[PDB]
């Protein structure tokens, strides 16, 4: 058996089943596995990427690929206009969050 390379934040876990079926989620992970740079980088986040999944409605997923361990961190998932533009203080906190989390997991 192999340990999973995918790691869900509490927020993502809270929201995943709403936006994706298990089958769709499996395919999304498989796409990420093959192409970890699948999404586009969100500026000033230290490499967080943003990807839209077509699926109802389309979903956006935010993730970070930790290159060192080849492991994926799934931040959050949302529909159109449920998230907002970040400012400096928020990018600061978000990067610290990624870090802290990365170090607990």
């Amino acid at each position, epitope marked *: 058996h192999m340990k999973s390379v995918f790691v869900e934040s509490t927020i993502f876990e809270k929201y995943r089943d709403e936006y994706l079926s298990d089958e769709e989620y499996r395919l999304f992970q498989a796409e990420l596995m093959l192409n970890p740079k699948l999404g586009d980088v969100i500026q000033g986040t230290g490499g967080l990427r943003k990807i839209r999944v077509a699926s109802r409605g389309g979903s956006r997923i935010i993730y970070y690929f930790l290159d060192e361990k080849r492991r994926f961190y799934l931040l959050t998932i949302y529909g159109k206009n449920e998230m907002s533009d970040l400012n400096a203080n928020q990018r600061k906190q978000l990067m610290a969050f990624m870090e*802290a989390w990365r170090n607990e997991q």
Partner: nanobody
Amino acid sequence: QVQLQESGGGLVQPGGSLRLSCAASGFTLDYYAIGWFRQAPGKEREGVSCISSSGGTTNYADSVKGRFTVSRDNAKNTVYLQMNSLKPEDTAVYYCVADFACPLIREYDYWGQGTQVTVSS
């Protein structure tokens, strides 16, 4: 199953106090920002307060500023809202969210059933 558990509500006289609790269930809230919004019947959701994971950053809505104090205890997995000088305008059900930063990034959404706060004579 992850959720936030709100408690500490109740009825109080004008000028009175209450302390509200937001306790994570099914996860650890240490690294997350937490915020409060409230909803009264016939009113839209209105943001109340928010706090960063380290506690070094707090936010308050204008109409509660000065009166409310938000704090957290990470070892206890709980966030608090100290409400002082309560006004009838503060009557509402209070709800807790978890997020990546303070100020909040995501639009308000329910993490629990909330706690009722009534201030009246």
